[PDB]
Design an enzyme around this catalytic site. Sequence first.
Site, PDB file in Angstrom:
ATOM      1  N   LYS A  17       0.814  -1.233   0.000  1.00  0.00           N
ATOM      2  CA  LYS A  17       0.000   0.000   0.000  1.00  0.00           C
ATOM      3  C   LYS A  17       0.840   1.271   0.000  1.00  0.00           C
ATOM      4  O   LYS A  17       0.726   2.109  -0.905  1.00  0.00           O
ATOM      5  CB  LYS A  17      -0.962  -0.030   1.221  1.00  0.00           C
ATOM      6  CG  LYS A  17      -1.579   1.285   1.687  1.00  0.00           C
ATOM      7  CD  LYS A  17      -1.836   1.220   3.194  1.00  0.00           C
ATOM      8  CE  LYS A  17      -0.504   1.279   3.920  1.00  0.00           C
ATOM      9  NZ  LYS A  17      -0.398   0.545   5.208  1.00  0.00           N
ATOM     10  N   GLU A  33       1.797   7.095   7.071  1.00  0.00           N
ATOM     11  CA  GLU A  33       1.417   6.444   8.313  1.00  0.00           C
ATOM     12  C   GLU A  33       2.144   7.200   9.405  1.00  0.00           C
ATOM     13  O   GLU A  33       3.334   7.470   9.292  1.00  0.00           O
ATOM     14  CB  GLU A  33       1.874   4.976   8.334  1.00  0.00           C
ATOM     15  CG  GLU A  33       0.844   3.966   7.821  1.00  0.00           C
ATOM     16  CD  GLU A  33       1.212   2.498   8.065  1.00  0.00           C
ATOM     17  OE1 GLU A  33       2.335   2.227   8.528  1.00  0.00           O
ATOM     18  OE2 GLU A  33       0.374   1.604   7.796  1.00  0.00           O
ATOM     19  N   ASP A 110      -2.636   7.606   3.815  1.00  0.00           N
ATOM     20  CA  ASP A 110      -2.223   6.226   3.982  1.00  0.00           C
ATOM     21  C   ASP A 110      -3.033   5.711   5.170  1.00  0.00           C
ATOM     22  O   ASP A 110      -2.626   5.882   6.314  1.00  0.00           O
ATOM     23  CB  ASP A 110      -0.740   6.152   4.284  1.00  0.00           C
ATOM     24  CG  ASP A 110      -0.173   4.819   3.957  1.00  0.00           C
ATOM     25  OD1 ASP A 110       0.024   4.534   2.756  1.00  0.00           O
ATOM     26  OD2 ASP A 110       0.036   4.034   4.885  1.00  0.00           O
ATOM     27  N   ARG A 111      -4.194   5.134   4.853  1.00  0.00           N
ATOM     28  CA  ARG A 111      -5.206   4.597   5.766  1.00  0.00           C
ATOM     29  C   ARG A 111      -6.245   5.635   6.273  1.00  0.00           C
ATOM     30  O   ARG A 111      -6.000   6.848   6.285  1.00  0.00           O
ATOM     31  CB  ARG A 111      -4.584   3.808   6.919  1.00  0.00           C
ATOM     32  CG  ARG A 111      -3.689   2.683   6.484  1.00  0.00           C
ATOM     33  CD  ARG A 111      -3.280   1.847   7.656  1.00  0.00           C
ATOM     34  NE  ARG A 111      -3.955   0.565   7.578  1.00  0.00           N
ATOM     35  CZ  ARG A 111      -3.347  -0.610   7.550  1.00  0.00           C
ATOM     36  NH1 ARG A 111      -2.028  -0.692   7.599  1.00  0.00           N
ATOM     37  NH2 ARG A 111      -4.075  -1.708   7.475  1.00  0.00           N
ATOM     38  N   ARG A 168       7.156  -6.311   4.489  1.00  0.00           N
ATOM     39  CA  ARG A 168       6.500  -5.123   5.077  1.00  0.00           C
ATOM     40  C   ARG A 168       6.287  -5.373   6.547  1.00  0.00           C
ATOM     41  O   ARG A 168       5.168  -5.320   7.042  1.00  0.00           O
ATOM     42  CB  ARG A 168       5.136  -4.873   4.447  1.00  0.00           C
ATOM     43  CG  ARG A 168       5.190  -4.316   3.058  1.00  0.00           C
ATOM     44  CD  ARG A 168       6.104  -5.110   2.161  1.00  0.00           C
ATOM     45  NE  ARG A 168       5.844  -4.791   0.767  1.00  0.00           N
ATOM     46  CZ  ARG A 168       6.548  -5.264  -0.260  1.00  0.00           C
ATOM     47  NH1 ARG A 168       7.579  -6.076  -0.051  1.00  0.00           N
ATOM     48  NH2 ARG A 168       6.170  -4.976  -1.507  1.00  0.00           N
ATOM     49  N   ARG A 170       6.869  -3.733   9.720  1.00  0.00           N
ATOM     50  CA  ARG A 170       7.082  -2.531  10.561  1.00  0.00           C
ATOM     51  C   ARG A 170       7.922  -2.838  11.823  1.00  0.00           C
ATOM     52  O   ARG A 170       7.841  -3.938  12.386  1.00  0.00           O
ATOM     53  CB  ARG A 170       5.755  -1.876  10.943  1.00  0.00           C
ATOM     54  CG  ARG A 170       4.774  -1.699   9.813  1.00  0.00           C
ATOM     55  CD  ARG A 170       5.168  -0.744   8.704  1.00  0.00           C
ATOM     56  NE  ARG A 170       4.048  -0.664   7.755  1.00  0.00           N
ATOM     57  CZ  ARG A 170       4.096  -0.137   6.531  1.00  0.00           C
ATOM     58  NH1 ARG A 170       5.225   0.391   6.037  1.00  0.00           N
ATOM     59  NH2 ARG A 170       3.008  -0.166   5.782  1.00  0.00           N
ATOM     60  N   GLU A 173       7.595  -6.002  14.463  1.00  0.00           N
ATOM     61  CA  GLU A 173       6.504  -6.861  13.993  1.00  0.00           C
ATOM     62  C   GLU A 173       6.838  -8.359  14.068  1.00  0.00           C
ATOM     63  O   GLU A 173       8.017  -8.748  14.031  1.00  0.00           O
ATOM     64  CB  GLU A 173       6.184  -6.540  12.534  1.00  0.00           C
ATOM     65  CG  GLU A 173       5.025  -5.616  12.298  1.00  0.00           C
ATOM     66  CD  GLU A 173       4.599  -5.572  10.831  1.00  0.00           C
ATOM     67  OE1 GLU A 173       4.392  -6.636  10.194  1.00  0.00           O
ATOM     68  OE2 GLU A 173       4.438  -4.459  10.311  1.00  0.00           O
TER      69      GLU A 173
HETATM   70  O1  LIG Z   1      -4.773   0.153  13.973  1.00  0.00           O
HETATM   71  C1  LIG Z   1      -3.706  -0.314  13.601  1.00  0.00           C
HETATM   72  N1  LIG Z   1      -3.177  -1.356  14.305  1.00  0.00           N
HETATM   73  C2  LIG Z   1      -2.222  -2.164  13.903  1.00  0.00           C
HETATM   74  O2  LIG Z   1      -1.989  -3.181  14.545  1.00  0.00           O
HETATM   75  N2  LIG Z   1      -1.588  -1.799  12.757  1.00  0.00           N
HETATM   76  C3  LIG Z   1      -0.355  -2.575  12.301  1.00  0.00           C
HETATM   77  C4  LIG Z   1      -0.300  -3.165  10.905  1.00  0.00           C
HETATM   78  C5  LIG Z   1       1.229  -3.296  10.607  1.00  0.00           C
HETATM   79  O3  LIG Z   1       1.758  -4.263  11.475  1.00  0.00           O
HETATM   80  C6  LIG Z   1       1.767  -1.982  11.168  1.00  0.00           C
HETATM   81  C7  LIG Z   1       1.733  -0.798  10.164  1.00  0.00           C
HETATM   82  O4  LIG Z   1       0.420  -0.564   9.646  1.00  0.00           O
HETATM   83  O5  LIG Z   1       0.877  -1.782  12.299  1.00  0.00           O
HETATM   84  C8  LIG Z   1      -2.023  -0.704  12.054  1.00  0.00           C
HETATM   85  C9  LIG Z   1      -2.988   0.107  12.452  1.00  0.00           C
HETATM   86  C10 LIG Z   1      -3.346   1.166  11.635  1.00  0.00           C
HETATM   87  C11 LIG Z   1      -4.061   2.221  12.103  1.00  0.00           C
HETATM   88 BR1  LIG Z   1      -4.440   3.771  11.013  1.00  0.00          BR
END
Ligand SMILES: O=c1[nH]c(=O)n([C@H]2C[C@H](O)[C@@H](CO)O2)cc1/C=C/Br
Lengths: 304, 309
Positions: A17, A33, A110-111, A168, A170, A173
């Site tokens: 994304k 993000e 982005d979201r 991907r 993060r 993770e």
């Molecule tokens: O609410 C969330 N909770 C969550 O667990 N994630 C995770 C997904 C990936 O591991 C990393 C980056 O998106 O974080 C994203 C969000 C996005 C919120 Br806008």
Amino acid sequence: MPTLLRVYIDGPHGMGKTTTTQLLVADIVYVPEPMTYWRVLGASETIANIYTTQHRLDQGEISAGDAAVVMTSAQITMGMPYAVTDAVLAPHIGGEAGSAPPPALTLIFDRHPIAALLCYPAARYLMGSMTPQAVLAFVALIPPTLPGTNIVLGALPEDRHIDRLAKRQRPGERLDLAMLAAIRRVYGLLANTVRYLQCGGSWREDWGQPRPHIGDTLFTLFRAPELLAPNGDLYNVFAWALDVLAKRLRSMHVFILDYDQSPAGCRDALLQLTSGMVQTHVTTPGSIPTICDLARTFAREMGE
Amino acid sequence: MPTLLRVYIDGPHGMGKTTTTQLLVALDIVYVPEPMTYWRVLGASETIANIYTTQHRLDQGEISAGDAAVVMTSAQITMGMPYAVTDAVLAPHIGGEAGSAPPPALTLIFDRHPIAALLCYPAARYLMGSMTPQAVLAFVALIPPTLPGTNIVLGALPEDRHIDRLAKRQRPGERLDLAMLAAIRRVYGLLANTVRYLQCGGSWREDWGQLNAGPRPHIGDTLFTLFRAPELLAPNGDLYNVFAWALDVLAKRLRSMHVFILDYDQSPAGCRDALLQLTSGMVQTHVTTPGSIPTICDLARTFAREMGE
Ligand SMILES: O=c1[nH]c(=O)n([C@H]2C[C@H](O)[C@@H](CO)O2)cc1/C=C/Br
Ligand SMILES: O=c1[nH]c(=O)n([C@H]2C[C@H](O)[C@@H](CO)O2)cc1/C=C/Br
């Protein structure tokens, strides 16, 4: 008043994304993000925190309820930048542009707020780490759907997505395939719920279990025993929360981006989906400059 | 076109807010109680008991600052839930302000308002060290838009009479913490000031460096002063833009509210009557359909029946 076109790239993580969305941008702004807020600003290593709690729970190290306070708290930190962004942007948004001229501005978010307020919380409950009532509290706090809300959700085969997700990852993770399944399912039900709603589906009339069957929408997640009276009836509090979910989702404009393709490809496609998106007017002359700055300051401060 | 009158009686707990709300409805009107059942069983188990226990362990030093914040924040989400959904369903029935104008077709007397769960207690818990300011600001960012005719009555009771009053009654799970009492008292005090400051033309941004029903108060006497937290400050000294945006929302949300003060240092009936007097000059709103009244009436009815007592 000039027109703005807001597009929210959303869907499960690991589909590419962000990559493809910066790729088409870099009259067009990219709101990333809030990684810096997640890692440092709101709290430290929220992501790591989320993936660690699940693992400890998964491993029997904590109780489902401990995983839940931490999970709920973390999800509050996760969507904070989204809640304020929507809140500050809300007044500048006017009604839909006769859909329209080239928009004076294009925001690539982005979201959307629903990822943190609905999708991820739902996934975590499906993972046994969030109470369906906490989820329903997040839903109740979902901001009214401003006009022109275009959400681009993604489409990608599971194994291809597992391949893509391997990278991907993060900061902090864990490659949790069950979460990937849960989140894919959650974003799936959501695409189905929007259609069900847009096609005239009434959750209250369908609860008893063209357009998708209620059993293939988010409403199925809330047939949770915790939400039911000893007689099986949904408590009114929870039912009113489903009414909110229903009016917030019915006005969102959904588009699908097949990620099973090359970056330029995913990117081109995204530029294609643009022609059917609903744009809107800004409320003031100063809306475009003020929105543009907002977007540039968010990126600058929280992008990572 | 029918008119509705909404009145939210709020303020620190232990002042006698609910007796007086009820007395007033005993005098058409509909009372919307505290969702004690949602807090005790529907949303979570003994949520209030949890709050008072968590702060205690923090105080005793059994739990750690962040261990408590994670519990306080989740507990605060549960506390506010019924408030936030009821607001979300009400919203599309509320029309333009009318005034107090003839008698309203329906009068809604609410026990507390959404900001109690999403701002006041959280801001109070932040001061108690059991919550972080980022989280409080997270809740603030989710404060629903202020509908017109948002009349809020906050209470006033002498610190000592309050302590005794608190000291007499018994909530289930609650624990006598006069430190939290003072915290909640100062917080509702800053709220009252904040509304007036905003309604007097103040701009927290203009006055940040400086950190009617009376004159404009000093920003340091408003809720903006709680956010001079080190964790919200960038290296250059100013607030990060995320947090400053959260404060803009706080400004927007509270400037259109109509806040009133009711003194609880009198008999139950005295309070009943003092509030009946403030109510007369309270802004009414039209509904969005004649049939919004029946609907609104029932929503309130069901809420009470399902989550009250
Ligand atoms: O609410 C969330 N909770 C969550 O667990 N994630 C995770 C997904 C990936 O591991 C990393 C980056 O998106 O974080 C994203 C969000 C996005 C919120 Br806008
Ligand atoms: O957010 C809250 N948090 C909290 O600690 N309380 C406490 C006050 C008293 O001890 C008891 C009953 O209101 O619960 C109230 C609220 C109500 C919010 Br609406």
